[PDB]
């Protein structure tokens, strides 16, 4: 079965971008969606939208890359350089507000889930909470 | 002072005029001018490329052998300067330069530091009007470094200060002659000293 559906998405995305797709489909959940809301806001995607494949509900993510490059290998720079699940099943990772990590000196984000809802690193620290550290993205 | 040996064979090992003697070092000697190669039967054959380590080592020696100080007492200063807040390298220089044995040399009471060391150990130097016979003593800012009241008409001191009449003393030191009195205005900053040491290197050697 699908043991972690968040990693599934996070990965689904990582996979798609490395072959430069225009978009990719993840099967849908509000929680998954509530993450894409942030990916989108912070500039990591072009955004997403609830499409509908074979009558079951998916979230089409629209990916985003650099410009074409120079010399041999013109494949463009990735926008999502790096994106990885931190907390996982059978190793949940929770942090105090005093422990929310500075990712790449802030050049990257770290989505975490708090009782004020899903939030970036900057968001929670400048709002006073902590929670389950979901994933770093940079 | 300390080390107590041939000093100019050290000038000749660092390949640098070190002035561990003051006066004669301005003559046609210091060892360097006329014979500026290393001491020893070998110090005149084509010099092999110094290992990364030697380079950083020889550089520390160049700094320590200037101020004439045990490695035990050098490192103790460096570690302190390390723990301390600020560019740990220049704080080090600030610390060596804050030594009384050296401040006496800076204010030209002695013509060398070896001479300035003894001038203190034999009690001719006073701090804030009290006497201090420790080369180690850390001069703080605001302190006045006098020549001892009852040492004033002394031969070594007379010549040494009629020579100081009309000479400039560092931008971090005051000094009035006739009164045999200096003043530690401030800890010098890195560009205030003109030390032939990379110093950045000295830091690297103490983490080998």
């Amino acid at each position: 079965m699908l043991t972690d559906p968040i990693a599934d998405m996070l990965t689904r995305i990582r996979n798609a971008t490395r072959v430069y797709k225009e978009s990719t489909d993840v099967p849908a959940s509000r929680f998954k969606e509530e993450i894409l809301r942030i990916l989108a806001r912070e500039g990591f995607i072009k955004g997403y939208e609830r499409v509908d494949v074979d009558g079951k509900p998916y979230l089409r993510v629209y990916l985003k890359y650099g410009p074409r490059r120079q010399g041999p290998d013109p494949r463009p720079e990735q926008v999502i350089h790096h994106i990885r699940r931190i907390s996982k099943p059978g190793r949940r990772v929770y942090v105090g507000v005093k422990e929310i990590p500075r990712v790449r000196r802030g050049l990257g984000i770290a989505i975490l889930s708090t009782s004020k809802g899903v939030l970036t690193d900057r968001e929670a620290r400048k709002l006073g909470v902590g929670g389950e550290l979901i994933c770093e993205v940079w | 002072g300390r080390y107590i040996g041939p000093v100019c064979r050290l000038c000749r090992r660092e390949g640098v005029k070190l002035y561990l003697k003051g006066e004669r070092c301005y003559s046609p000697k210091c060892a360097m001018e006329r014979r500026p190669y290393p001491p020893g039967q070998h110090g005149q054959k084509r010099a092999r490329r110094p290992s990364d380590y030697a380079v950083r080592l020889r550089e520390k020696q160049k700094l320590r052998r200037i101020y004439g100080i045990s490695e035990r007492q050098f490192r103790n200063l460096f570690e302190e300067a390390s723990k301390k807040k600020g560019v740990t390298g220049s704080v080090f220089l600030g610390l060596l330069e804050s030594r009384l044995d050296n401040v006496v040399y800076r204010l030209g009471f002695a013509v060398s530091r070896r001479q300035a060391r003894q001038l203190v150990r034999h009690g001719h130097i006073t701090v804030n009007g009290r006497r201090v016979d420790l080369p180690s003593y850390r001069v703080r800012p605001g302190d006045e470094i006098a020549v001892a009241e009852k040492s004033r008409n002394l031969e070594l001191i007379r010549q040494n200060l009629e020579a100081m009449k009309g000479r400039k003393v560092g931008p971090w030191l005051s000094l009035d002659v006739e009164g045999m009195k200096g003043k530690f205005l401030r800890l010098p900053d890195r560009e205030d000293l003109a030390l032939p040491v990379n110093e950045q290197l000295v830091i690297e050697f103490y983490s080998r």
């Binding site: 500039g43 650099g66 926008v79 790449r104 050049l107 | 600020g86 560019v87 950045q200």
Partner: protein, 150 residues
């Protein structure tokens, strides 16, 4: 102009009938100490030739390193082969705290304060190729903003 350093020279050897036949390799670095570095691997019949060749090789293959007050934007870690290099920014007064290979490269790039760790295989050649890759991979807030606008 440029400053050359040379991290290792070595004396490889191949077999032909009746005797081994030698050769020399040179890893050299060039830098202007203001954000430009090049790594050159020059192999050749005799030593000083193999150096010359590396210096030239090192000048094509330049990296534009985005210094900031003597250090780096983020912190990268990079794997080249089984070599891993770990780069970490440090405040002024720290110095290049690094193994002797990325030190060569970093100092010549003009990084004056940094933290380093060689992890995994320590082959000086692959370690050099890795810190070059680490450097090639640095981004600044400037170029990240561009990436995620539109």
């Amino acid at each position: 102009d440029f400053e050359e350093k040379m991290i290792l020279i070595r004396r490889t050897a191949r077999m032909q009938a009746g005797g081994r036949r030698f050769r020399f390799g040179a890893l050299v670095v060039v830098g202007d100490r203001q954000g430009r570095v090049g790594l050159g691997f020059g192999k050749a019949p005799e030593v000083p030739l193999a150096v010359q060749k590396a210096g030239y090789y090192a000048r094509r293959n330049m990296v534009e390193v985005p210094l900031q007050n003597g250090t780096i934007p983020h912190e990268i870690e990079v794997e080249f082969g089984a070599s891993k290099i770990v780069l970490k920014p440090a405040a002024p007064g720290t110095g290049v705290i690094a193994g002797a290979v990325p030190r060569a490269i970093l100092e010549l790039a003009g990084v004056t304060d940094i933290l380093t760790k060689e992890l995994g295989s320590r082959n000086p050649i692959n370690i050099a190729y890795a810190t070059m890759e680490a450097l090639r991979q640095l981004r600044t807030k400037a170029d990240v903003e561009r990436l995620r606008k539109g």
